[PDB]
Amino acid sequence: SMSVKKPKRDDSKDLALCSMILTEMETHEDAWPFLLPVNLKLVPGYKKVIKKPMDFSTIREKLSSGQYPNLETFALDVRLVFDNCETFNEDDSDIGRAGHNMRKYFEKKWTDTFK
């Protein structure tokens, strides 16, 4: 509360560390469904169904331009990519499997770096 604070965590490396995680996600062989925004002119149903499209190139641009206020907002966009994937794609499909794989990959890096 006012004048009552937990000891100050060093957040000075967070930006660099999120960048590194994102590079690791970008270079994973199963990243291909997530690298660029879904083409809303060419994929029937996506625009109406997926209220908040997100992809790794969009996260990279937001990260590089100071649009994440803290590491929780960054994790929320990464998770949105996989939540969107699950919404639109059957589990038993190449893309559906890709999204589960990538979510697991991310969550381990996230825990290992920050927990």
Burial of residue 30 (CB within 10 Å: 0-12, 13-18, 19+) is middle
What CATH code is carried by the domain that includes residue 106? 1.20.920.10
What is the SS3 assignment for 114?
helix
DSSP of 76-109:
HHHHHHHHHHHHHS-SSSHHHHHHHHHHHHHHHH
Residue 41 CA, distance from chain mean position: 23
Number of domains present in the structure of the chain: 1
Which two three-digit tokens encode residue 31? 């990243």
- Experimental technique behind these coordinates: X-ray
Distance of CA 78 to the CA centre of its chain: 1
- Segments forming the whole domain that contains residue 84: 1-115
Token pair listed for 65: 């331009």
Task: Report the residue count for the chain.
Answer: 115
